[model samples]
Target chain A: VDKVAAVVNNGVVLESDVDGLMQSVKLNAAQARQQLPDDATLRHQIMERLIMDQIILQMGQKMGVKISDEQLDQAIANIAKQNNMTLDQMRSRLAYDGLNYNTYRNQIRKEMIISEVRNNEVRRRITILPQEVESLAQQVGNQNDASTELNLSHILIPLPENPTSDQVNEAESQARAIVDQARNDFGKLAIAHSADQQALNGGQMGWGRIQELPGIFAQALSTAKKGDIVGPIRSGVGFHILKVNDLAAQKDRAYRMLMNRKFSEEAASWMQEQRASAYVKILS
Target chain B: VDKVAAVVNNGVVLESDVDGLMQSVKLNAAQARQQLPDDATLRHQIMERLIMDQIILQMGQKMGVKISDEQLDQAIANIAKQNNMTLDQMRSRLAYDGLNYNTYRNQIRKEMIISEVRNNEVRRRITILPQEVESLAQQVGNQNDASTELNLSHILIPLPENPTSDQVNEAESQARAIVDQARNDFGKLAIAHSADQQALNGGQMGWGRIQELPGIFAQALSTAKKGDIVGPIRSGVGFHILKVNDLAAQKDRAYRMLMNRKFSEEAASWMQEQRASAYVKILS
Candidate 1:
């Protein structure tokens, strides 16, 4: 039975929508050889996504965003061309995949709307500075050891934007104790104790060149061995702990990387902020 | 009976975990006056998050990251202090909320690990450049007006990173057609036609000072009216369409904006890439 899966402000995600997306996601994952979480988890992800979609769609509605059929057809044609197929061929492919052409078109239209919303939101939020670019470029030029790379795990006890003396002291103590408790096994400790973003993945920083590493981390890692744990180091952000997991190494265009990074982070944080601020209710 | 909600590589998210999180999220949302998505949607979101937690936890296990009881205690104390409560008060508060102290501690531990993992992954993926920084600083310095603001809506027919002349022509034509179709009702057209992120929000770019807006946008908007549709303008990224939504603006520290934008975009993209690359199987 078609039922309401979730409610965003002024909109509802139907059970049918969830089922449809699940089928598509599963199919895509299979094609990409990507792993998926359990059924419940996947559904949850889909619902969250749908909620975001609803939020964005409502914003579009308020703004009076609309797409003409001609525009959509053009988009469809372009996509077909990109896939090295004619419009008819593409339609047949959709049919073979059990998708009605009109349904697919509507889906595409929805996607187009979402894309527009995301870009406007994120791009406006981004402000790139010349100094930032120059600094990154200089760093790229200064990169000396392009060979040796290190795979590290990390832990951070983050400070408030403007931490108090008490806050600092408390954080430091925690970091120190965490370092000691870690002894040599830091991954689980990182997960259980660190406040860094990588805490979830056992604080794995993956592999990076020495010069690419943060100055403090590089300094600490220079004399460190494979199994060595380093630091309760102090940084502006907070106290940090590092584990040299392994050692490896890229210098993509600074501007591109900078732009990509900015776009990516803003997109994520904005979505998070939107979800956090929105009134939502999940039915059992 | 407790059931499995998700399977993440070597870990499973129990149904119990979802229920706990749902309750917590709902409680938090109520406190913050934040609206929530519907029940099914919320549950789906929770499940996905749990799946991610399992993935991170597994990494922690593999990396041998451990948090001793003492470390956990320290964390608990810190949390209590931040909340302006003593450990005993915190304990009572948890009891009032009907939470088991052990369960709370374990949840905290899990969060710490996830944070560590995310940071390590994102930080390493980020590469900042001196040139990028300098460029942004210069832009900040060269600002002409600090008062007048413009709210803009946009649409883009994006080009591939390296587009051939044929691709350029196709995008330009699409942009032209979109402009014609927009007439005065640009928002809806932006949604259906534009490949820009803000399509869903009717291409609303929000408000920004003239200097804050992109150069091309600023130039185009100079003569544009409140409801005017402008562009099919060409830029490196692609052909752009703009409707001046409204305008106002900031010169935050170049470094801060740069860092934030970079971090935000990278973090988001990394999560997407991770999810895309991971082999997840959702069991029915």
Candidate 2:
């Protein structure tokens, strides 16, 4: 090929790159259940992807951002995890589909870099006033339990699989003892007995609404009184216990929580904005 | 403020977009960067930009490729006239920044439509050939054009701004006669009367060796030849006349012209292979 396409900053987009993107899109559309468009539609789609990629890439360069090798590896791992596969398994799967694992990782990493840059540089500048938060909270309502709150601490005692009755009883007893100690030394008990990953942080799951927890956990917490130590509840995995530090009737959802969620939504909105501002050029 | 941030699709890059991208990146990074080891450079970058926007939006019960109308309008208008002005001016002196106005037009339209859904559709079946186009072109020695041949043609006309009546009559008579007799009329006319342009055509201005024209014009036409014409010469907005045609030669210095260059069969085939197996996910 002797053609040069568009130039982005120091880089150039080749015509072949645009063609490859188009081809990829065509293949994807055929496999998907949704009705695929004609050749013209597909071409437009490919072009769009190329443009978006160019914009973001341009922005990323200006910000002095980069995706390191380690980041790429982790992104690959994360993709694998999402698809319920090991990193190697995901690599094989992607390879089977004619997609290079490295390329995919790089794509993911670029997306991440651009996203992070946007959040820190653009989204953070957007401020939600207290009044705005309150108004938004009211408009959405607490039907989704926006006002619901939970202050939860947990302790876990893991037991061997297919444990005998005596082993289960021993684990139960251990859980009970931890809960008992939680009455006074809640933080210490959590650190010592909790098998959860955050045990070091006193098993604090942070503040969440009832809806945010699993159904069983939420139901149990809802019925349990404030300052109550509930559980030693036998679930599928292990003996679990939760301590309710405090409870209060929420007449209205916390404005800050609503604002945080709103912020998240707005941040997403801003990402689209940044993506729009950047130029995406593809070289196949 | 000044940086090279990210690379996308080999050519699509994000440099200036870094400010906004960093904002988004930091949102996730603030939580993950602390957990990563100081030496785990890549991991930190990945964690920061890891999350992909959901392919769905609750409000419209539609895919998340929704770009606001206002944003689209703004983006389109931003690049329409160039030079980054908020207000539209009819006579604004704008210089080409290597990007054509038409290119931005396509860009804005693509951004509006290619959301998560569109992306998914295209990327799903992309396949990369083991040998890429660039490498194949290199192997075939297509990367250089030093020994390449060019066919040149041209017409020339002289103009006198303060010509005597006799001089003007002679020039006009000669120009009219040449225009009628030329085989390639456009080329001949372009060359002869094109005092401001070049005399490459039989007034038509055809292709030529890069070294044939004046330094400035040769530089511009370094990559152009064979059926291409130079111009309608500008002699104070009046006409001049001349013709030069069908001259062929090889030059020692042949510049590589990638812009408007043709792609090789091998590269096309490779790109086709890659496109066949890419996985694309477009939310909208």
Q: Superposing every Cα of model 2 onto the true structure, what RMSD results?
A: 35.3
Write down the lDDT of every candidate, Cα atoms only: 0.68, 0.47
List the candidate 2 regions with Cα displacement exceeding 4 Å: A2-11, A138-284, B1-284
The residue-by-residue lDDT of candidate 1 on A1-284, one tens digit each, is 68999888757999999889998877755543346798888888888888888888788777877666676777677667655789989888899989999998888778666655665677678765433443343344323333455678889998986799999999899988888887746889877878877888889878766544555556565555466678888765688887775540012244555656787777777888878877788764
Among incorrect, acceptable, medium and high, the docking class of model 2 is: incorrect
The candidate that wins on TM-score is: 1
Superposed Cα deviation of residue B231, candidate 1 (Å): 14
What fraction of native interface contacts does model 2 preserve?
0.00
Candidate 1 wrongly placed segments (more than 4 Å): A1-284, B67-74, B144-252
What TM-score would chain A of each candidate receive against the reference chain A?
0.59, 0.48
- Write model 1 residue lDDT over B1-284, tens digit each, in one string: 55877777866878788878789778855653346799988888887777776776677777767666666566667646644688778878988888878778777777555555654567677664433433344345333333345677888788887889998988878777777777737778777877866888888877665544544455555544456677878765678888765420111244456656786788778767766666566655
